[PDB]
Amino acid sequence: SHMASMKHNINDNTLEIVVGDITKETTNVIVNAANGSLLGGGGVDGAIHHAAGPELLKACQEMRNNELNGEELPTGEVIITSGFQLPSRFIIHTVGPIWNQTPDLQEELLANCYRNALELVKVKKLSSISFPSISTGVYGYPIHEAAAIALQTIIQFLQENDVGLVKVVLFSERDYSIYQEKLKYLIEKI
Ligand SMILES: Nc1ncnc2c1ncn2[C@@H]1O[C@H](COP(=O)(O)OP(=O)(O)OC[C@H]2O[C@H](O)[C@H](O)[C@@H]2O)[C@@H](O)[C@H]1O
């Protein structure tokens, strides 16, 4: 029942980090750590598909067959679907880098997930979004490095743009603790 949280205001925006389950967030948008196929998986992708219900998979399949003409979603890029049975209005699906598959591009590619998702929130005039810890599960990205990239990217975006609320939802107290220390470090540098 205790779930740690902390927040920081950046101009008129708010950045919050929390322990929780992203499928229970009532932000306008939640972000899925997907794979290029968009057909689901385990971890957060599996949780989102289970919570959203079977209409999500159908929607992803139709997006693959029509708008993508069978192509997979590239690493760092985003697509948007409805939230279906989630408490959110939309799901932004992204694909994080698989750790050390492309060592010279992966920091940029991870940042892209966050920047592209936030640009889409801006475009659609949505005012709240939740992120998971993209790429730090099965994709193997070290949490200390990923948390730095995630937070630096979000902070920079919120310094330069009006968005609203950005939440990072950590699934463990271990990840939360690391995020908290990184966020505090980054705030002191502002
Ligand atoms: N309900 C949840 N809410 C928030 N975070 C969660 C939840 N469940 C897990 N996490 C955390 O979410 C974070 C990311 O872990 P992972 O979900 O493996 O994502 P990746 O980007 O590394 O792997 C993508 C692949 O895994 C899938 O099969 C896809 O289809 C791809 O094949 C971790 O901190 C988890 O503990």
Residue numbers in the entry: -4 to 185
Please give the exact wording used by the authors of the publication that reports this structure.
Macrodomains are ubiquitous and evolutionarily conserved modules (approx. 130–190 residues) that recognize ADPr derivatives in their free form or linked to proteins, including ADPr, PAR, ADP-ribose-1″phosphate and O-acetyl-ADPr (OAADPr). To expand our knowledge concerning the field of macrodomains, we have characterized Oceanobacillus iheyensis macrodomain (OiMacroD), the first to be described from the order Bacillales. A yield of 40 mg of pure protein per litre of culture after a simple two-step purification process was obtained. Its phylogenetic analysis revealed that, among the six different classes previously described for macrodomains, OiMacroD is included in the MacroD-type clade, together with other previously characterized MacroD-like macrodomains, such as hMacroD1 and hMacroD2. The subunit has a mixed α/β fold, similar to that of other nucleotide-binding proteins, composed of a central seven-stranded mixed β-sheet (β1–β2–β7–β6–β3–β5–β4) and five α-helices.
Electron-density (ED) maps of native crystals soaked with ADPr (OiMacroD-ADPr) or ADP (OiMacroD-ADP) show a large mass of ED that matches an ADPr or ADP molecule bound to the enzyme and follows the same pattern found in other MacroD-like structures. The adenine moiety is stacked in a hydrophobic pocket with the highly conserved residues F166, I17 and V39. In addition, it is also strongly bound to residues D16 and I17 by main-chain interactions, which belong to the highly conserved sequence DIT in Block I. The pyrophosphate moiety of ADPr exhibits a rich network of contacts, which are decisive for ADPr binding. This pyrophosphate moiety is surrounded by helix α1 and the P-loop-like β6–α4, previously named as loop 2 or diphosphate-binding loop, with its positive dipoles oriented towards the phosphates, thus stabilizing the negative charges. Residues S130, G132, V133 and Y134, belonging to the P-loop-like motif (Block IV), and V39 (Block III) in helix α1, are directly involved in diphosphate binding. Finally, the distal ribose fitted in a cavity surrounded by the glycine-rich loop β3-α1 (Block III, G35–V39 in OiMacroD), also termed loop 1 or catalytic loop, and residues V133 and Y134 from the P-loop-like motif (Block IV). Residue G37 (loop β3–α1) anchors the distal ribose 1″-OH group, whereas the 2″-OH group is bound to residues N30 (loop β3–α1) and D40 (helix α1).
